[PDB]
């Protein structure tokens, strides 16, 4: 009964349909395959400082475009070649829709209706693809000629230092003439305002005064939500995706207890960035946060699963670990499964083969239930300037010391199997280098498991977990070593 | 105002008046010090695994002990000659009050009501002190007897790993009687359930159950005091200390939310252990979280001011640092500063002489403007186990990179100084850093002489554009031109 919240990205759907021409009828067919599913509402982007969509207010994608021309056009000139081809495939796919009078927006949140599915908005607040190129065909003009406007102005060390600060009246207009215009053109169930599109709004330092700025930046859109309510004929719901954890929004300038409490949103997604899906998120923590505002407290997924931020390895989840992440989520409270990063083709999970049999399993624990599942230890991407970052992985272990890793499992295992499994970086090790316990319990030694993907490219130990250690939620592997290792992967893998 | 509550220890007092004989008068001149401040409440610990007055249903610190024998006695026996000396100053004195016909906490509460403070026993829930030695004084013979009631029974890492596992229905009746014990024999406004002596009362990986245990034990009490009410003939407060952050309070099975809701608490320390002060703690959170429940939250400093877990300073608050601290605390929306380890004598600010000010002081922003005050960046020593840990210092920062620490300064600053004060361990010029505060470049001072608390390694200031500062947290941002490692940061605010 929790169900599924899908985001459908602002370039996905165009770069993978590019040199169809397509018809109305195929653009419909995009949101079946999500019917008949756990989902309950597709988040429709269709910006990033660029539309996808021919707006009067924003530039579309294709503002600078020549058809007929040559790959080799101003618009595109700054990318190598063999990039040129990938942006020109978005650039020109958004384009001919416009050019035959198919609106893609108006057409999905048609179908969504048809199909059961609520359909929603979702709009970019701060994207900052590529911004190390000022000459890159995504950017808008308004952001190409002021500079001024940036947040970070004495260093370019990340992408995020050239985003836009909300605490600029001139910023705050530019993004809510979009949102005025997405009001206007879309009869939309529900606008997601997507901050975590890069999260980063402030001047390092001014975020506190930038909490005050959104919550009325905020609650403007929702007085004027409130309007079209009258005019459609129906509730409009207004939602935002938020840092996992309470300190790192506030410390971000997103206090989303005063927008739950002064009923500003309805809905909040909880979510990392983009480096890896967070299996650990303090879900309960909100819940009691948001207690009595009538919020929906939705549990964000991204598609990369990395052991640590200086991880090599960027392989996608699969089935088995969305099923530990939303099995853990649900099990803490979580009222929605919400899916970013995992569209139909290119931006997907690699068993792509499994996609239909996630969209109807992982949005209840009923449909997870007795479902083989992985939970790995991962980390949050995500961090106020200057805040302490907690990261669990890679961990030393020298010998004799004791290292400790809680996992959260959600419902307790069906009878069946748990492993606790355990890699060891830089090269190894006996059947009694290291004692594993659980809970307490003594795990025996299974040897080398072998992992489907995502795995390390290191060896992964396997440790049998006596059934009846397993409790609900939280489960803490307890390691020493009689030998120095340093550990970069931990899971429980639970085979009912 | 909020004012202060302050802790007085098990031990301190008996320790350090060793040797006097002492008047009943003697024994109430101990509050007095404290009259006429903003200290509002005194939180008297009479107990650690052993009680410091003659309990009935627990070992008082004298049991075993031969008041006319030598030094090395069985009490005793297992302390080296020179620690039988404090151990048995704080036994004797304990001892002797007794024999005198002197109950220190019932003169004490006495005392307090006459000097218009209100006066609280706080009971530590599962002090383990020294359980490194099984034979130790100051264990009790029933910890001595069970082993097969301590937390962790595979290893012995730190000393809450011999610490009673509160999973027992056994532990938790031992607890309760001693409850039931200081309920009947004292007349205090509160009991305050010490959880942070030591924070670990569960096996490790059965928090969640113990959630539900400490919530129905709190909820027991709570049914305990409201009996005694009736019988006293007034409103008897319960209060708590917890972790700092609401993840580590949950995770080391204390779910002082339900607490609050249910009405079983109405005051909430949050507090570090023991390691240092911790001069950033998410107040404004919990505010959100006890919003309506109408529990006083109470923000609890200890003495000790250390910049990260493995240094080898163990030097203590000043004035200026606790200035900083409490400033800070109440701007994030403190209802209480509550001193932990702030005694009058030997566990105590190393600048004593400014003792009487800080209790005049530290309890209103009103008090504590336009007064010179440091903001120093350190560390949560507590987190519940495998929980992953956010430390700051030290901090590496690479040729060319971009390092940022953001320290909570509590009230824009007055008309004056401000300068970031940053120590560098293990040779710099004045361009071998950039420092910028909320993006504002700041000069260079060259080398601070800082007063106690201080590094015994370089510490560099930089001015800061007065108008720079903001409201709460404030943003050092640092790039280096050559590899530098900082275990020392702070904001000195001087009007
Ligand atoms: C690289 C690619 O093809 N698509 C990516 C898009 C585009 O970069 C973006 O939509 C441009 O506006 O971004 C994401 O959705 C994202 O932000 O997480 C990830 C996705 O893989
Ligand atoms: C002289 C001395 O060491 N006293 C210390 C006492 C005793 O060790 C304790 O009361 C034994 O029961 O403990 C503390 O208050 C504590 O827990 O932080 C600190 C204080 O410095």
């Known amino acids: 009964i929790p169900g599924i919240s899908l985001n459908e990205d602002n370039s996905h759907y165009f770069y993978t349909r590019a040199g169809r021409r397509l018809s109305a009828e195929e653009v419909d067919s995009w949101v079946d395959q999500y019917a008949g599913t756990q989902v309950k509402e597709l988040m429709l982007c269709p910006n990033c400082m660029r539309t996808s969509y021919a707006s009067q207010v924003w530039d579309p994608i294709w503002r600078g475009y020549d058809p007929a021309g040559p790959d080799d056009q101003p618009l595109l000139a700054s990318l190598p070649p063999e990039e040129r081809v990938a942006a020109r495939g978005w650039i020109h796919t958004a384009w001919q829709l416009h050019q035959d009078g198919i609106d893609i927006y108006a057409r999905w949140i048609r179908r969504c209706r048809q199909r059961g599915i609520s359909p929603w908005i979702s709009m970019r607040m701060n994207d900052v693809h590529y911004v ?6 995504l950017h808008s003009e308004f952001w190409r000629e002021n500079p001024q406007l940036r947040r970070v102005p004495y260093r370019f060390a990340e992408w995020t230092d050239r985003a836009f600060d909300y605490g600029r009246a001139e910023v705050r207009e530019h993004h809510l003439k979009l949102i005025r215009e ?3 053109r879309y009869d939309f169930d529900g606008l997601e305002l997507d901050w975590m599109r890069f999260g980063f709004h402030f001047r390092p330092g001014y975020e506190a005064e930038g909490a005050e700025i959104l919550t009325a930046f905020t609650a403007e859109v929702r007085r004027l939500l409130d309007d079209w309510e009258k005019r459609r004929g129906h509730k409009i719901h207004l939602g935002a995706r938020i840092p996992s954890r309470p300190a790192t929004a506030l410390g971000l300038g997103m206090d989303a207890v005063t927008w739950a409490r002064r009923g500003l949103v309805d809905m909040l997604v909880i979510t990392p960035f983009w480096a890896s899906a967070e299996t650990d998120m303090p879900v309960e923590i909100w819940r009691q946060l948001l207690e009595g505002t009538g919020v929906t407290l939705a549990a964000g997924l991204e598609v990369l699963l990395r052991p640590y931020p200086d991880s090599p390895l ?6 088995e670990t969305v099923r530990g992440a939303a099995a853990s989520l649900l099990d803490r409270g979580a009222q929605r499964i919400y899916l970013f990063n995992y569209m139909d083709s290119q931006t997907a999970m690699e068993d792509l083969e499994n996609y239909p049999t996630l ?5 209840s ?3 997870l239930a007795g479902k083989p599942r992985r939970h790995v230890l991962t980390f949050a991407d995500t961090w106020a300037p200057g805040e302490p970052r907690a990261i669990p992985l890679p961990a030393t272990c020298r010998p004799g010391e004791w290292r400790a890793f809680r996992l959260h499992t959600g419902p307790k295992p069906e009878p069946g199997e748990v492993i ?8 190894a090790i006996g059947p009694e280098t290291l004692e594993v316990r659980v809970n307490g319990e003594l795990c025996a030694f299974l040897g080398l498991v072998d992992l489907s993907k995502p795995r ?12 009846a250690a397993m409790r609900r939620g939280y489960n803490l592997i307890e390691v020493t070593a009689r030998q120095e290792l340093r550990f970069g992967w931990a899971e429980f893998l639970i085979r009912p």
């Open 132 to 137: 190390n190129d000022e000459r890159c065909f």
């Open 456 to 467: 390390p490219d290191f060896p992964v130990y396997g440790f049998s977990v006596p059934l």
């Open 365 to 367: 624990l009923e449909t």
């Open 182 to 184: 997405l009001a206007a």
């Open 420 to 427: 606790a499994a355990l890699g060891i970086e830089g090269g």
């Open 359 to 363: 969209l109807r399993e992982i949005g």
């Open 314 to 319: 960027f392989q996608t989840n699969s089935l």
